[PDB]
Design a protein around this ligand. Structure first.
Ligand SMILES: CCCCCCCCCCCCCCCCCC(=O)OC[C@H](CO[C@@H]1O[C@H](CO[C@H]2O[C@H](CO)[C@H](O)[C@H](O)[C@H]2O)[C@H](O)[C@H](O)[C@H]1O)OC(=O)CCCCCCCCCCCCCCCCC
Ligand SMILES: CCCCCCCCCCCCCCCCCC(=O)OC[C@H](CO[C@@H]1O[C@H](CO[C@H]2O[C@H](CO)[C@H](O)[C@H](O)[C@H]2O)[C@H](O)[C@H](O)[C@H]1O)OC(=O)CCCCCCCCCCCCCCCCC
Ligand code: CLA
Ligand code: CLA
Ligand code: CLA
Ligand code: CLA
Ligand code: CLA
Ligand code: HEC
Ligand SMILES: CC1=C(/C=C/C(C)=C/C=C/C(C)=C/C=C/C=C(C)/C=C/C=C(C)/C=C/C2=C(C)CCCC2(C)C)C(C)(C)CCC1
Ligand SMILES: CC1=C(/C=C/C(C)=C/C=C/C(C)=C/C=C/C=C(C)/C=C/C=C(C)/C=C/C2=C(C)CCCC2(C)C)C(C)(C)CCC1
Ligand SMILES: CC1=C(/C=C/C(C)=C/C=C/C(C)=C/C=C/C=C(C)/C=C/C=C(C)/C=C/C2=C(C)CCCC2(C)C)C(C)(C)CCC1
Ligand code: OEY
Ligand SMILES: [Cl-]
Ligand SMILES: [Cl-]
Ligand SMILES: [Fe+2]
Lengths: 37, 442, 27, 97, 334, 137, 36, 30, 244
């Protein structure tokens, strides 16, 4: 468990490790926006 | 020239944007290390072995000597928190510089400064960048030596008393030992560098590696490639990438075997037992159980005529019987007290097995690295109940896959770099088809 | 819940693209 | 002339009781108080000419002699069968679950 | 006109009927050694104690086998992953009993096959081709590494590598399923899709091109004579093929770019077989197929069997019988 | 079929008193059995000594009878061999040995009751499967 | 056996050195288009 | 007689390999 | 000096019995009021000889030499037992326990593999009377048990066994069973062997002895499927004696 003072952010921490995956997906939103040029 | 699906190849000759891509990517690496550690810690329960909890980064920190005490008991979780927060914080700085250099900064560097700019074909500049990074790497290896010798030491599973953190005061410097490893066979009983089984050799190897890297860095800052090297390589950015892809491939294959066989720099306290270890522990467990019932395990002939519990290896060593005869090269702290000069000592087996050795074998046999993709532990015919897949299976399989694909990446980019350098990566010139100016084979 | 965070973090990405596409930015 | 000696043994009291001379040690779990201590002693001190002989095992306490005495009707003895006692098979006969 | 340069010119010559090359310098001796030993062993080798239990398995023709049952038998479990060349044995008789030939063959073959892949790159470079045919071949090559090297490494013994024989291959398969539930593993499922889909697209492309051949011959001659080696014009009408196939499904499900089509033909089975090679290679480290044994239970807790539980019954049967004399303890951990 | 009070009714002691668990206690005890026991006792067998299982008829014949809540709670505090002759706390998880078996440290008295109740209820549901091993999978 | 071992060590060394020196003998230059 | 037969068929295939490679009908351009 | 495991491992020294210096020509006195044990008996075979079958009339074939194919897995070691003094001053060794068997297979000329269970199980070996001292002319003669090479759970390649397995040739459902009875019915042999141990070296100070041995016993009969061969085994032995 995190230290008590940071217990508030526990649900945030459970989600953080997936964030690098979102960067790969963001590349395809960007390319969709400019039309895969 | 490149389509959107090959879009990052548009960065080849934009040194400023390519710097941003690299630095932003470094931030992603440091981000994952930060966030994953916190996730693992948020989910950590100290009463459970680390390997029952799906942890791969916390075991790396514990191995460095932070947070653990005798036997690998977690005594203080704050060093885990710190390692994760500091990595997490640092990824913002790298992300910041990465996106700046990729979006806003100068698109190419060589107009802004002759120091930071580079041409891929400039062999002097390329080996200078290589030399700088060699020095950084050499410093990196000395940090581990520093931690081991001057800042609390490393976790030692072989330490007398169950394992403990231990400062290394006599790292091995004898190059016959250090380089002897590089020349051992990779086959069974030898194991190449994967067989390193004590921290003195580990620390000594890193002193050597740090010096060699620093020396090589200065060498490459001061020189340019000799003519034999100039005629033997392709000198382009894609060629350099392909070389590194081959190197990463080789290293991933090694790492796979390291985590699968080595229980020294991957302590079983943290990562769980190895395949060979758990198989040895099952023979140990039933040797103990049967001997307590009155069995004379030394003289018990099994169905095949070989000993039911004990037999000889092909070079004579007394070893555990059954199918685990294949795993007799296994060495571990819970088993070595029973070994005499001829292998397992029957007098020690009869008289000197301790309860802590019985517990450990029972624990390791029931935590063998077998499990399903959905994390049902045990052989493939086992029923649901036990949620478990060994960290060693996770780390071995993941890195075998990565190592394989990077070997394919090496082939892809090596062949393309050759074709591009000779001028036919885009296909065959209809007006100058080489085969049409060659004589036929018949 | 945990889905509150990942919603806020999830929308952030497409939000940058949208803001730049409406402001006609360097996309 | 060619007979399976283990099948033949199933036709004797070996097939219905715990044979103090032949049966694997895990069968002593079927009755209370016998496993593992008394089972260990019984197997180690085989063979026996008669079921009553187990009471003469040196070292037995009066509680252990009581346990055996209550269980004498579940025991038998037949001639030692080499195929059942070789290999250490009275301690581990290769049957688990 | 230096002597070393003349050798170098012959090794890399594009005029040799069979290209040699620098990869070929290694490939030719290792493949010959592996081939010669394999043929001799297949015909005449004595039985091998593959499982290390002094129970030799007869693999060769002269010892009572036919083409379907014969094999070069894997090396003894007593050897494990130890290197066992001829010169480590007290005698050839010892070396044969313990399965030495299998090691000699698979090591020479994997080396020679790896150089075969390199040779494909090398000649492509001498002919001014694009370079990636060798990347296609890395899929079968990786599969051979998986069953001959990687799986034995993870399991600790070349005795668990795939035998060099037809019935031995099926033995390897059956035992693999009992211990890894490979059928329920997605990388094998992807391999089936790469192999089924590869056969499908092979037949599709072959039938579409054949369907749209341009009339160039009479009914009394093979249509094949309507193509002459090296002619500049295409021999079929791809727009007619596209017009047929696009109407058979719908327009945008059909290719009209031949480069895209042939790249697709290359990529589908190659990637599928990469995954199945990776499946063997990761089940080597015992990360096994999905386990849904007793995953469905009713309101009381009764197990409600599914087809996964029936699979498990079959797997249990293979488990309990395989190597029926080699296990002394309840768990078959490797 | 459902988890009725009759199946949830198990012996409390050797004297013949009974106790009726709640569904909650049963599910709690199943979770705790998986956490602390299943690595060796999955399905009611014993991986490291298959001669001894968790079938009710086996537990009934142990000394101290263990086919009741009390006998099972006592076993988790001070395990003995099957004939009662020696204490085996140093090789078997128990509260007496939670220093060396750290998963036992945070088990409370009611956790023990739930674990014991799970062990006694499960053969009533699964029959021969519980402690039968792979033959009945 | 020792003779066999020595013979194989020499034969393998020979072929490996051919491989290494072969690819060090200006291999990039051996193509049909651009030699350098 | 069955060993002889298997080996014979196998030897014929190897000989066929030789002719199919070195005595093929040569591909001639256009 | 004594070596460690890591000095021995992989060398083949693990299969060799300890040796005595050629100067160890002493004598170990035997006090009959004392009791003694053999703390370690080690037997290292060096030669495996098999008797051939002479087929014709009264010819009696000889023992021919064989090649070992199962590597350095042959030695009996860590054997212990009581060493009694008998009323006539002969000593009797009574084996109690140890690694007292090794499966071995040797190959005869022509390719026939002969498997055998090299053993001294239940060895009782005795000297001549009036010993009072173990000397470099002391001989032990004894006999031992040779149980079946496979034990009762062993399954043949068609699933047949003694304590387990099929009782018939299930692949030939309507074959006449009388011709297959020898292969269908497994039996467990228990035979005896003979051994001589000749003391050639004695360390009178430490109680270690070493010397030469020869045993004769039967080979494997594959659970009654075929007739065993006669095997003669020669080698060296080492023993350590202690006051019990
Ligand atoms: C430049 C080009 C280079 C080309 C080189 C050409 C020759 C290469 C030879 C490679 C063949 C090696 C096979 C590995 C066999 C094996 O036992 O390898 C495992 C060994 C480790 O060996 C084990 O090492 C162990 C070390 O542990 C010991 O020490 C430990 C210390 O804690 C523990 O105590 C442990 O219990 C104890 O046993 C023991 O020695 C074991 O008996 C021994 O098996 O790993 C290793 O040496 C690490 C490296 C192995 C990598 C090989 C992976 C092959 C990947 C091929 C990729 C497929 C290609 C796809 C193509 C498309
Ligand atoms: C529409 C498409 C949208 C998504 C596109 C993505 C396509 C590919 C990915 C498929 C995603 C679907 C499944 C995602 C959910 C999942 O997986 O869910 C599973 C888990 C979350 O579930 C938890 O899974 C756990 C798995 O056990 C782990 O935890 C246990 C309890 O601690 C034990 O510690 C056990 O040993 C340990 O393994 C337990 O079962 C928990 O009870 C359960 O909650 O997510 C995880 O782990 C997260 C893992 C993600 C990180 C990837 C790491 C994988 C690297 C290994 C790969 C090597 C390759 C081998 C090839 C074969
Ligand atoms: C690690 C992954 C990675 C990285 C670092 C890069 C980086 C880059 N790519 Mg590549 N790319 C990738 C993956 C990646 N790419 C993938 C997977 C694809 C396939 C779809 C592509 C396809 C692709 C194409 C087709 C092209 C590039 C190009 C580029 C460059 C310019 C892009 C640009 O200006 O966009 C501008 C985009 C925006 C302004 C939108 C906003 C983007 C921002 C940066 C999002 C960041 C959010 C983040 C949370 C910020 C945190 C801030 C905080 C730290 C303070 C840049 C160096 C281009 C190039 O080479 O140009 C010469 C180009 O043409 N890429
Ligand atoms: C690269 C190395 C690596 C390794 C060895 C592991 C290993 C593990 N992780 Mg970690 N993880 C990683 C990268 C890695 N992960 C990354 C990059 C992320 C960010 C998304 C995470 C995020 C993450 C979370 C959020 C969690 C784990 C968990 C776990 C455990 C269970 C894994 C599981 O069931 O997956 C299931 C298997 C799959 C999903 C298979 C995916 C196959 C892909 C699609 C094929 C790839 C083809 C090519 C690359 C295991 C110890 C879990 C755990 O127990 O934590 C304590 C958990 O909750 N991990
Ligand atoms: C390897 C990565 C890398 C490389 C090669 C460069 C290279 C460059 N940057 Mg970039 N940058 C990076 C990372 C990198 N940067 C990061 C991480 C950030 C975010 C902080 C930035 C943010 C940034 C900005 C905002 C600007 C540049 C600019 C420049 C150019 C001139 C810089 C100069 O003269 O500094 C001189 C050197 C120093 C001041 C060094 C001071 C001491 C340093 C900080 C010590 C380094 C710490 C240590 C070695 C490692 C980090 C510790 C960590 C591991 C814990 C040059 C091309 C400028 C530019 O392009 O102008 C148009 C510019 O405006 N950079
Ligand atoms: C990231 C690390 C790195 C990289 C990429 C390079 C790259 C380069 N170096 Mg440098 N070098 C480095 C680190 C590195 N170096 C370090 C740390 C040192 C200090 C020891 C040196 C010392 C050094 C010298 C002394 C020289 C170079 C030279 C060169 C160039 C030619 C290299 C070559 O032909 O290799 C190909 C390799 C060979 C021809 C021989 C390989 C022999 C190895 C040992 C075979 C073993 C491989 C085996 C299969 C795998 C198992 C490992 C085994 C050892 C057990 C090239 C630009 C040359 C040059 O032009 O410098 C100006 C040169 O003469 N380097
Ligand atoms: C350090 C590693 C590295 C680097 C820097 C590069 C860099 C490059 N590669 Mg190479 N590549 C690598 C490794 C690497 N590669 C490996 C390991 C392989 C073998 C698989 C390849 C195979 C390869 C091919 C076949 C080609 C390149 C090409 C290129 C160029 C364009 C890349 C691009 O725009 O992709 C854009 C990115 C995408 C289109 C997205 C890729 C999406 C991946 C496949 C999905 C992965 C998902 C993952 C499994 C997780 C699943 C979870 C789910 C949620 C998604 C660029 C120079 C191209 C080239 O030759 O240009 C010169 C090209 O055609 N690469
Ligand atoms: C392996 C490390 C085990 C763990 C974890 C648990 N148990 Fe166990 N158990 C184990 C063994 C080797 C034995 C036999 C001990 C002996 O020699 O007698 C047992 C036995 C039991 C019993 C008795 C069974 C009977 O009498 O028939 C019980 C009731 C039992 N174990 C319960 C139990 C519980 C509740 C556990 C989780 C807290 C648990 N065991 C874990 C091995 C292992
Ligand atoms: C270029 C480009 C790209 C890429 C990008 C990148 C990759 C980036 C990166 C970035 C990054 C890499 C970022 C980072 C960030 C980070 C951050 C921002 C952090 C923060 C942190 C915090 C704030 C924390 C907090 C805390 C603490 C301190 C304690 C504990 C708890 C918590 C966690 C809460 C793309 C592909 C998209 C597209 C194209 C272009
Ligand atoms: C730390 C440590 C250690 C140490 C280590 C070391 C010391 C290492 C080293 C290492 C090394 C020292 C390495 C090396 C490497 C090498 C390589 C890897 C090579 C490569 C090569 C190549 C690749 C080449 C190629 C080619 C050819 C062949 C021909 C021509 C062309 C070319 C060039 C292409 C030890 C183990 C003790 C312990 C633990 C820790
Ligand atoms: C650490 C931290 C942080 C940071 C964060 C970040 C860094 C974030 C980012 C984020 C991101 C980075 C995001 C992104 C996302 C994205 C997405 C959401 C995507 C999606 C996609 C899709 C869905 C796709 C689709 C498609 C297309 C487009 C086309 C093709 C087809 C398809 C369908 C595939 C903060 C500040 C919070 C604070 C706390 C801590
Ligand atoms: O599957 Mn079952 O597991 Ca892999 O070993 Mn243990 O038995 Mn045996 O050697 Mn071939 O085979
Ligand atoms: Cl089998
Ligand atoms: Cl076994
Ligand atoms: Fe085609």
């Amino acid at each position: 468990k995190l230290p008590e003072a940071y217990a508030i952010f526990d649900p945030l921490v459970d989600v953080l490790p997936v964030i690098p995956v979102l960067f790969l997906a963001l590349a395809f939103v960007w390319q969709a926006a400019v039309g895969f040029r | 020239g490149f389509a959107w699906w090959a879009g990052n190849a548009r960065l080849i000759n934009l040194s400023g944007k390519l710097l941003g891509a690299h630095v932003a990517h470094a931030g992603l690496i440091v981000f994952w290390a930060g966030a994953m550690t916190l996730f693992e810690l948020a989910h950590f329960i100290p009463e459970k072995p680390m390997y029952e909890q799906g942890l791969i980064l916390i075991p790396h920190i514990a191995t460095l000597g932070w947070g653990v005490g005798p036997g690998g008991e977690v005594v203080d979780t704050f060093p885990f928190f710190v390692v994760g927060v500091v990595h997490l914080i640092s990824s913002a700085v790298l992300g910041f510089g990465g996106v700046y250099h990729a979006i806003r900064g100068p698109e190419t560097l060589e107009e802004y400064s002759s120091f930071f700019g580079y041409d891929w074909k400039d062999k002097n500049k390329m080996t200078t960048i290589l030399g700088f990074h060699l020095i950084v790497l050499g410093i990196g290896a000395l940090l581990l030596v520093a931690k081991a010798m001057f800042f609390g030491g490393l976790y030692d599973t072989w330490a007398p008393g169950g394992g403990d953190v231990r400062v290394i005061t006599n790292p091995t410097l004898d190059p016959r030992v250090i380089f002897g490893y590089l020349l051992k066979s990779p086959f069974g009983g030898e194991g190449w560098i994967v067989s390193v089984n004590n921290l003195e050799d580990v620390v000594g190897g890193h002193i050597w590696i740090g010096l060699i890297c620093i020396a090589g860095g200065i060498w490459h800052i001061l020189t340019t490639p000799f003519g034999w090297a100039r005629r033997a390589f392709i000198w382009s950015g894609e060629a350099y990438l392909s070389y590194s892809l081959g190197a990463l491939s080789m290293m991933g294959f090694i790492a796979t075997c390291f985590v699968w066989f080595n229980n020294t720099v991957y302590p079983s306290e943290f990562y769980g037992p190895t395949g060979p270890e758990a198989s040895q522990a099952q023979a140990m467990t039933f040797l103990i159980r049967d001997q307590k019932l009155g069995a004379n395990v030394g003289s018990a002939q099994g169905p095949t005529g070989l000993g039911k519990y004990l037999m000889r290896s092909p070079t004579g060593e007394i070893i555990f019987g059954g199918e685990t005869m294949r795993f007799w090269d296994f060495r571990g702290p819970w088993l070595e007290p029973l070994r005499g000069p001829n292998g397992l000592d029957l007098n020690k087996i009869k008289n000197d097995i301790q309860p802590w050795q019985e517990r450990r074998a029972a624990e390791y046999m029931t935590h063998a690295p077998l499990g399903s993709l959905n994390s049902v532990g045990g052989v493939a015919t086992e029923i649901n109940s036990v949620n478990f897949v060994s960290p060693r299976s996770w780390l071995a399989t993941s890195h075998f896959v990565l190592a394989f694909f990077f070997l394919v990446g090496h082939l892809w980019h090596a062949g393309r770099a050759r074709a591009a350098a000779a001028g036919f990566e885009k296909g065959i010139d209809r007006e100058s088809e080489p085969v049409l100016s060659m004589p036929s084979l018949d | 819940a945990q889905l509150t965070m990942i919603a806020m973090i999830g929308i952030a990405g497409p939000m940058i693209i949208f803001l730049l596409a409406v402001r006609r930015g360097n996309l | 002339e060619l007979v399976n000696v283990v099948d033949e043994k199933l036709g004797t009291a070996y097939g219905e009781k715990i044979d103090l001379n032949n049966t694997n040690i895990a069968a002593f779990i079927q009755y209370r108080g016998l496993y593992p201590t008394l089972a260990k002693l019984i197997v180690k001190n085989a063979p026996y000419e008669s079921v009553e002989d187990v009471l003469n095992i040196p070292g037995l306490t009066e509680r252990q002699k009581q346990i055996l005495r209550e269980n004498l009707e579940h025991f038998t003895v037949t001639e030692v069968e080499t195929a059942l006692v070789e290999g250490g098979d009275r301690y581990n006969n290769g049957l688990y679950k | 006109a230096n002597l070393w340069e003349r050798f170098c010119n012959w090794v890399t010559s594009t005029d040799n009927r069979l290209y040699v090359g620098w990869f070929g310098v290694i490939m030719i001796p290792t493949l010959l050694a592996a081939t010669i030993c394999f043929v001799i062993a297949f015909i005449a080798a004595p039985p091998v104690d593959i499982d290390g239990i002094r129970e030799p398995v007869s693999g060769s023709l002269l010892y009572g086998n036919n083409i379907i049952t014969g094999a070069v038998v894997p090396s003894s479990n007593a050897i494990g992953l130890h290197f066992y060349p001829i010169w480590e044995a007290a005698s050839l008789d010892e070396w044969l009993y313990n399965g030495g030939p299998y090691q000699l063959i698979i090591f020479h073959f994997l080396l020679g096959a790896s150089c075969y892949m390199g040779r494909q790159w090398e000649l492509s470079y001498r002919l001014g081709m694009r370079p990636w045919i060798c990347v296609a071949y890395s899929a079968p090559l990786a599969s051979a590494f998986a069953v001959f090297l990687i799986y034995p490494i993870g399991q600790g013994s070349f005795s668990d590598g795939m035998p060099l024989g037809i019935s031995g291959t099926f033995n390897f398969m059956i035992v693999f399923q009992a211990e890894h539930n490979i059928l329920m593993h997605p990388f094998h499922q992807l391999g089936v899709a790469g192999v089924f889909g590869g056969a499908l697209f092979c037949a599709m492309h072959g039938s579409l091109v054949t369907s749209s051949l341009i009339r160039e011959t009479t009914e009394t001659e093979s249509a094949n004579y309507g193509y002459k080696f090296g002619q500049e014009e295409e021999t079929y009408n791809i727009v007619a093929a596209h017009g047929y196939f696009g109407r058979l499904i719908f327009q945008y499900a059909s290719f009209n770019n031949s480069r895209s089509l042939h790249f697709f033909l290359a990529a589908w089975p190659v990637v599928g077989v990469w995954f199945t090679a990776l499946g063997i290679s990761t089940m080597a480290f015992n990360l096994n197929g999905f386990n849904f044994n007793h995953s469905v239970i009713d309101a009381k807790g009764n197990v409600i069997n599914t087809w996964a539980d029936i699979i498990n019954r079959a797997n249990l049967g293979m488990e309990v019988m395989h190597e029926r004399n080699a296990h002394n303890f309840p768990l078959d951990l490797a | 079929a459902e988890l009725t009070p009759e199946v949830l009714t198990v012996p409390l002691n050797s004297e013949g008193k009974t106790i009726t668990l709640t569904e909650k206690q049963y599910l709690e005890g199943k979770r705790l059995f998986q956490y602390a026991c299943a690595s060796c006792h999955v399905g009611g067998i014993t991986k490291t000594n298959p001669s001894l299982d968790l079938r009710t008829e086996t537990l009934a014949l142990a000394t101290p009878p263990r086919d009741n809540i009390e006998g099972l709670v006592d076993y988790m505090k001070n395990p003995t061999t099957y004939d009662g002759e020696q204490e085996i706390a140093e090789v078997h998880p128990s509260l007496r040995s939670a220093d060396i078996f750290p998963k036992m440290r945070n088990l409370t008295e009611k956790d023990l009751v739930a674990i014991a109740g799970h062990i006694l209820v499960e053969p009533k549901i699964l029959g021969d499967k519980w402690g039968g091993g792979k033959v009945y999978y | 056996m020792e003779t066999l071992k020595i013979t194989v060590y020499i034969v393998v060394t020979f072929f490996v050195l051919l491989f290494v020196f072969g690819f060090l003998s200006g291999d990039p230059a051996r193509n049909p288009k651009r030699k350098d | 007689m069955e060993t002889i037969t298997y080996v014979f068929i196998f030897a014929c295939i190897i000989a066929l390999f030789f002719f199919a490679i070195f005595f093929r009908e040569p591909p001639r351009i256009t | 000096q004594t070596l460690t495991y890591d000095d021995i491992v992989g060398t083949g020294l693990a299969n060799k019995c300890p040796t005595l210096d050629d100067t160890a020509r002493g004598a170990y006195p035997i006090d009959s009021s004392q009791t003694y044990r053999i703390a370690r008996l080690c037997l290292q075979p060096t030669t495996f000889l098999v008797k051939e079958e002479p087929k014709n009339k009264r010819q009696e074939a000889e023992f021919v030499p064989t090649k070992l194919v199962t590597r350095e897995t042959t030695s009996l070691d860590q054997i212990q037992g009581e060493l009694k003094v008998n009323s006539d001053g002969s000593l009797t060794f009574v084996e109690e326990d140890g690694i007292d068997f090794q499966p071995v297979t040797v190959q005869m000329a022509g390719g026939e593999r002969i498997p055998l269970l090299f053993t001294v199980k239940n060895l009782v070996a005795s000297t001549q009377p009036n010993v009072t001292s173990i000397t470099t002319s002391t001989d032990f003669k004894g006999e031992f048990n040779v149980p079946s090479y496979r034990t009762a759970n062993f399954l043949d390649p068609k699933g047949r066994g003694l304590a387990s397995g099929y009782d018939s040739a299930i692949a030939l459902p309507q074959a006449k069973e009388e011709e297959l009875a020898r292969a269908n019915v497994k039996r467990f042999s228990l035979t005896k062997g003979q051994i001589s141990l000749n003391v050639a070296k004695v360390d009178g100070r430490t109680g270690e002895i070493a010397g030469t041995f020869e045993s004769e016993q039967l080979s494997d009969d594959d659970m009654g499927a075929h007739e065993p061969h006669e095997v003669k085994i020669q080698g060296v032995f080492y023993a350590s004696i202690e006051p019990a």
